[PDB]
């Protein structure tokens, strides 16, 4: 049976899980919901068989999941990409939590009203952050070496969002600015980004500042 | 040698990790900073050997980690308590994300300003969230059934800090209210709480409204 991921019609926390699936050339079908359809959601929210009703959600035969990460860490984990050995396993978890610090650092205020004023406070911490990746991919093709892991999209995402809040901000980081290319290079992702699927704007909710 | 886990002198994201440890009777020694000691932190912040400098951190021979989860998922992992199978691995990653949804619902508000302007707006959809557990802890002893996993503790604290703001809250949720006891009903855990190692408060931090 074909798996069923589900989430609004934005990028939010699903965007990365899309590419992880896109890059694995996996077959799956999307179940979206648009800015008003909040009803049909509040409708099936408890009709699907999810222990913890929430969006996004993933359903194949075996499981019925809800919790963005537990859903990518599954798809990935299915195809041994998680690392078979504590250290290496914690090593992605460390690359996970980080990419979501740069990723949540927008989401927070992205809603928290008066954006302009706050953005800055944040944008001046983004460097101690973005930095660490410039000096990671400094002698590594992708975050975790030779092969593509799953954080290697979570970040590609974080970036893909920031060049929208201050397009320059990457520059001092060639490795990163280049990074974003090496990814969009991966044929499978190409197929996608120039597809009819690909959901362009928005990055947050149809509310967000 | 003896492992080092470091954080500020509060509970924040470490509290859980400490119990996971405490529960496993594991040996480890603390390294905590106070509300003023920010310097000494900003000091060794890059002298340790951490690929991604941040608080808290965990160091023990093989790995030097940052990222709160990556840490706990490591201690745990290192004892098999993470489930050796995809489904049962994502199951715990489902619980994880959801216990954090309660804690991350009291820390972008408590960092906002006068919390009284961003309190209940979430204390709104806190129920469905709490509820979902009331219902998971229906037939099961621990969030995962027969044996203690790591999201348990997580929860245990999530809840612990929740009583704080407005005691009553856990009422229509006796399975829960009951739960907490079942936890601090574990010998080992009981051995901490009463002791001179458990940090009283602030459970949150020193910038709590
Ligand atoms: C944890 C705070 C983050 C808040 C911002 C979330 C932005 C994405 S839009 C989806 C939103 N819920 C979630 O994303 C669930 C959070 C969960 N942490 C996850 O990672 O999946 C919702 O309105 N779901 C429909 C509903 O159940 O009301």
UniProtKB/Swiss-Prot annotation, chains A, B:
Binding site for substrate: 111
Protein's UniProt keywords contain Methyltransferase: no
Domain GST C-terminal residue range list: 85-203
EC number: 2.5.1.18
InterPro entries: Glutathione-S-Trfase_C-like, Glutathione-S-Trfase_C_sf, Glutathione_S-Trfase, Glutathione_S-Trfase_N, GST_C, GST_superfamily, Thioredoxin-like_sf
Alphabetized Pfam families for the sequence: GST_C_3 (PF14497), GST_N (PF02798)
GO biological process: glutathione metabolic process
PANTHER family assigned to the protein according to its UniProt record, in alphabetical order: GLUTATHIONE S-TRANSFERASE, GLUTATHIONE TRANSFERASE
Further details from the record: There are at least two isoenzymes of GST in S.japonicum.
Protein name in UniProt: Glutathione S-transferase class-mu 26 kDa isozyme
Natural source organism: Schistosoma japonicum (Blood fluke)
Lineage start: Eukaryota, Metazoa, Spiralia, Lophotrochozoa, Platyhelminthes
């Amino acid at each position: 049976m074909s798996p069923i991921l589900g989430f609004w019609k934005i990028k939010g926390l699903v965007q990365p899980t899309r590419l992880l699936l896109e890059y694995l050339e996996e077959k799956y079908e999307e179940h979206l919901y648009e800015r008003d359809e909040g009803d049909k959601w509040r409708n099936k929210k408890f009709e699907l068989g999810l222990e913890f009703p929430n969006l996004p959600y993933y359903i194949d035969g075996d499981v019925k999941l809800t919790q963005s990460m537990a859903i990518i860490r599954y798809i990935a984990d299915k195809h041994n990409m998680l690392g078979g050995c504590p250290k290496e396993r914690a090593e992605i978890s460390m690359l996970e939590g980080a990419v979501l610090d740069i990723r949540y650092g927008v989401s927070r205020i992205a809603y928290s009203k008066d954006f302009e004023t706050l953005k800055v406070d944040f944008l001046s911490k983004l460097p101690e952050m973005l930095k660490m990746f410039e000096d990671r991919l400094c002698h590594k093709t992708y975050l975790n070496g030779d092969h593509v892991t799953h954080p290697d999209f979570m970040l590609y995402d974080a970036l893909d969002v920031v060049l929208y809040m201050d397009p320059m901000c990457l520059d001092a980081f060639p490795k990163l600015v280049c990074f974003k290319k090496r990814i969009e290079a991966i044929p499978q992702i190409d197929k996608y980004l120039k597809s009819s699927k690909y959901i362009a704007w928005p990055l947050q909710g149809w509310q967000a500042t």
